[PDB]
C-alpha cells in the first residue's frame, strides 16, 4: 500500500524546491482558512507528512464535492513552492487528480512521520 | 526559483536581530579573511543581498571541500547576531545545510538588491 505513494517526494521538494515531479500522495487532513476559502492540507508521501501544502482556489470544487478528502490518494500534476522568511517551504497545489477515493483507501497508508523542519 | 529562497529573512534579521528562523539563502560570494581562516559571505535571500555574514570556523570544511560555494543554496540552522558600534549587524553562521550545489543551481537566483544599511 505504501508502494502506492511517492516515498521521498516531500523530502525532495523541501530540499530541492523543484516542481518537475508529479508525486502521488495521500491526504491526511484538510482544513479551510477563511473571497474563496483557502484549504491547507497535511499530506503524506508514505515516508513523511507535511502540513505546509495549500490548495489553489480553482481546486476548491474537488474539496467541496468531497472528491479530495482525508485518506484519498491523489497525483499532483502542477505545483509551486514559496519559501517563507523562516525557512518553511509552502507547496501550493495547482493541478491534481484524485486516483483513489477516501472510502476506497479507508485508512492512513503506512506510518509516515513528520518531515523534520 | 526565487520561491526557493527566504525572501525578507535578511531584512527581518537586520530589523529584529532574532535568531529563531532557519532561512534558506543563496551564497553569492565567499572570501577568506586570514588560526583557521575566517570566511566572510555575501548572501542573498532573493530580495536582498548582505555582506556581513561570517562563517563559524567549524563550518570551514564545507567551504574547503567545495560544498558551500558561490551560487549554492543552503539552509541556516543556527546563527548569532552581533551588532557593531556603527550599527551594522554581523550574522555569524553556526550550523547550516547545503540544499542544492552551485553547479545544480548554476546562476544567481533572481535580482536581489543590497540591503539598505
Amino acid at each position: 500500500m505504501v508502494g502506492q505513494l511517492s516515498e521521498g517526494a516531500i523530502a525532495a521538494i523541501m530540499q530541492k524546491g523543484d516542481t518537475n515531479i508529479k508525486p502521488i500522495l495521500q491526504v491526511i487532513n484538510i482544513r479551510p482558512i477563511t473571497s474563496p476559502p483557502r484549504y491547507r492540507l497535511l499530506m503524506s508521501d508514505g515516508l513523511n507528512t507535511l502540513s505546509s501544502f495549500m490548495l489553489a482556489t480553482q481546486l476548491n470544487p474537488l474539496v467541496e464535492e468531497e472528491q479530495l478528502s482525508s485518506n484519498c490518494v491523489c497525483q499532483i500534476h502542477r505545483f509551486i513552492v514559496n519559501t517563507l522568511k523562516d525557512g518553511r517551504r509552502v507547496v501550493i497545489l495547482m493541478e491534481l487528480e484524485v486516483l483513489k477515493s477516501a472510502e476506497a483507501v479507508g485508512v492512513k497508508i503506512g506510518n509516515p512521520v513528520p518531515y523534520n523542519e | 526559483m526565487v520561491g526557493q529562497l527566504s525572501e525578507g529573512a535578511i531584512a527581518a534579521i537586520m530589523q529584529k536581530g532574532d535568531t529563531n528562523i532557519k532561512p534558506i539563502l543563496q551564497v553569492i560570494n565567499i572570501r577568506p579573511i586570514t588560526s583557521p581562516p575566517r570566511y566572510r559571505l555575501l548572501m542573498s535571500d532573493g530580495l536582498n543581498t548582505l555582506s556581513s555574514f561570517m562563517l563559524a570556523t567549524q563550518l570551514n570544511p564545507l567551504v574547503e571541500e567545495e560544498q558551500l560555494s558561490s551560487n549554492c543554496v543552503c539552509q541556516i540552522h543556527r546563527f548569532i547576531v552581533n551588532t557593531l558600534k556603527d550599527g551594522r549587524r554581523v550574522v555569524i553562521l553556526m550550523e547550516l545545510e547545503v540544499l542544492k550545489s552551485a553547479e545544480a543551481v548554476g546562476v544567481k537566483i533572481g535580482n536581489p538588491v543590497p540591503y539598505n544599511e
Binding site: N29, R40, L42, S51, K108, E117 | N20, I21
Partner: peptide, 24 residues
C-alpha cells in the same frame, strides 16, 4: 523548529493523533 510559521500547526493534527496522546 520552532519556526514562527509552525505556530498553528496543531490546527492540522489528525483527530486520531490527539486521541492517542490520551490512550497510549
Amino acid at each position: 523548529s520552532p519556526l514562527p510559521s509552525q505556530a498553528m500547526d496543531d490546527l492540522m493534527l489528525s483527530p486520531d493523533d490527539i486521541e492517542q496522546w490520551f490512550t497510549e
